[PDB]
Amino acid sequence: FDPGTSNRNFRIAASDFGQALMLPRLYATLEETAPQVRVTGVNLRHGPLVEELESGSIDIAFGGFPTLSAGIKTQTLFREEYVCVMRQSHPALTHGLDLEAFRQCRHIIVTAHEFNHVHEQVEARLLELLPPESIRFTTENFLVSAVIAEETDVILTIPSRLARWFANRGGLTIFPVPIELPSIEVKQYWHERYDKDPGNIWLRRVIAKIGFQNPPA
Amino acid sequence: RFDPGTSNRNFRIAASDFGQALMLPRLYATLEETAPQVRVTGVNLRHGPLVEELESGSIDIAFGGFPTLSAGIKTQTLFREEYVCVMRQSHPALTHGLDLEAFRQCRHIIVTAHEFNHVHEQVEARLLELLPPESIRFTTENFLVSAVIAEETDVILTIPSRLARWFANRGGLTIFPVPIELPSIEVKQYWHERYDKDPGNIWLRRVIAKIGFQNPPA
Ligand SMILES: Oc1c(Cl)c(Cl)c(Cl)c(Cl)c1Cl
Ligand SMILES: Oc1c(Cl)c(Cl)c(Cl)c(Cl)c1Cl
Ligand SMILES: Oc1c(Cl)c(Cl)c(Cl)c(Cl)c1Cl
Ligand SMILES: Oc1c(Cl)c(Cl)c(Cl)c(Cl)c1Cl
């Protein structure tokens, strides 16, 4: 495998948020050292992710997938914490987001249990403490939810990197979540069968060298 | 029977990540004012026959362009869209003239749609035909993913003008015409015959049909 001449199309499975995080951080390496290598972001499916890595239909999975292990290698890239966002024109802005006021707001929830990524743990914690009538919107897409929160008076609970990126570019303001929530471990995953594949090795090597708390190159 | 004022029905709308972002903000006011506990769920498109999703009731309404949706399906046309191109303002090609050949030599991010059978597939096919394979750097199935990648890198993105405008308002992406002639798009709502007389379904359809899609959210 030669980056300088390869025209391989690498497929990375990740949430819309993960895709947006990853691809721009690969762009430098591509232009400088692998001008004909394509990167394709692929949405998470309802099916078994490991059976996608094995067939080689996906090269790499990026995110947090607790059901992955059997026949699957892993490397931990970083950890995330959650926060809430609301637009600056939201009535809750004045007095803040104590749990009681949190419950009286309207919410957009990102749903994940169908896709089996780590966000499902947050999804469950929110659903247990929130009156059913306070959930106005649901979506499977992080970016959909962020832009909806930008346009409407709904509270969104999300990974801190996603919140910061939108807050710095729009009317969203960041609040702690008045609910206990786990830390998140973000990893990259690949099947044993390709643990030795020169192309795979190269990509995951490049991914391991990315800085995930500074901007893209 | 369905009363929006008291219902706690969760409606499921199948749409691209872009249709979801267009639709849900424009339903918000109606829900708050006339159906405070009605929930709306944006559902991603899938490989499978969307018509079966509509048939079994797992989906209430499909929003977008779905040319394959025909038999046993009812439709209402909501608006027409046209394509444009975007690239970030710190992109070097944002000085010289961008005709066809300069378009073909730029780097591109493509939104792939054929696997999901929506109308964007027509544009995707024209792009794959037009462009040198080596000019295509990034592929994704999400419109919003491709828009933010284009804000952060020097790739060209060919997309619906509504989506280009929304992002352009942020100042990163600049709009210019696509240097080829692309099909005009008819955007519609679809529902299955089986639920044509279902009062909840009827209500959502009527609400969607009243939406002002040239204006911002109420
Ligand atoms: O897909 C995800 C990615 Cl990439 C990150 Cl970084 C986080 Cl924090 C979460 Cl929650 C998901 Cl689902
Ligand atoms: O770092 C990010 C980048 Cl590069 C993009 Cl494009 C987006 Cl959308 C987000 Cl959310 C983050 Cl955190
Ligand atoms: O899903 C779509 C929607 Cl809602 C619109 Cl408006 C357009 Cl123009 C296209 Cl191409 C798609 Cl795929
Ligand atoms: O009209 C739009 C609205 Cl309300 C949102 Cl939130 C987004 Cl992301 C886009 Cl693209 C459009 Cl066109």
Numbering used by the authors:
A (entry chain C): 90 to 306
B (entry chain D): 89 to 306
Copy text verbatim from the article accompanying this structure deposition.
PcpR and TcpR belong to the LysR transcriptional regulator (LTTR) and are responsible for controlling the degradation of PCP and 2,4,6-TCP, respectively, although their precise mechanism of transcriptional control is not well defined. In general, the LysR family transcription factors consist of an N-terminal DNA-binding domain (DBD) and a C-terminal inducer-binding domain (IBD). The monomeric structure of the PcpR inducer-binding domain contains two nucleotide-binding (or Rossmann fold) motifs connected by a hinge region. The PcpR dimer was established by interactions between β-strands and α-helices from each monomer.
The complex structure of PcpR with PCP displayed the clear electron density for two bound PCP molecules located in two inducer binding cavities (IBC). The first cavity (IBC1) was located underneath a hinge region between two lobes of the inducer-binding domain and the nearby second cavity (IBC2) was rather exposed to the surface. In IBC1, the PCP molecule was confined in a relatively hydrophobic pocket formed by residues S104, F106, L110, F151, F167, Y171, H206, H208, F231, P248, and V275. In contrast, the imidazole ring of H206 was pushed away in the PCP complex structure and not involved in a hydrogen bond network probably due to steric adjustment for the bulkier PCP. The second binding cavity (IBC2), which was unique to the PCP complex, was located near the dimer interface between α1 of RDI and α9 of RDII. The pocket is formed from residues F106, L110, R114, W254 and P305. PCP interacts with the indole sidechain of W254 through π-stacking, and the oxyanion of PCP interacts electrostatically with the guanidinium sidechain of R114. Additionally, two residues from the adjacent monomer at the dimer interface, V236 and E240, contributed to the second PCP-binding cavity. The titration curve of PCP displayed a two-binding site mode, one tight and the other much weaker. The second binding site for PCP had a Kd2 = 70 µM, ΔH2 = −9.0 kcal/mol, and ΔS2 = −11.0 cal·mol−1·K−1. This second binding event observed in ITC measurements correlates well with observed PCP at IBC2 in our complex crystal structures.
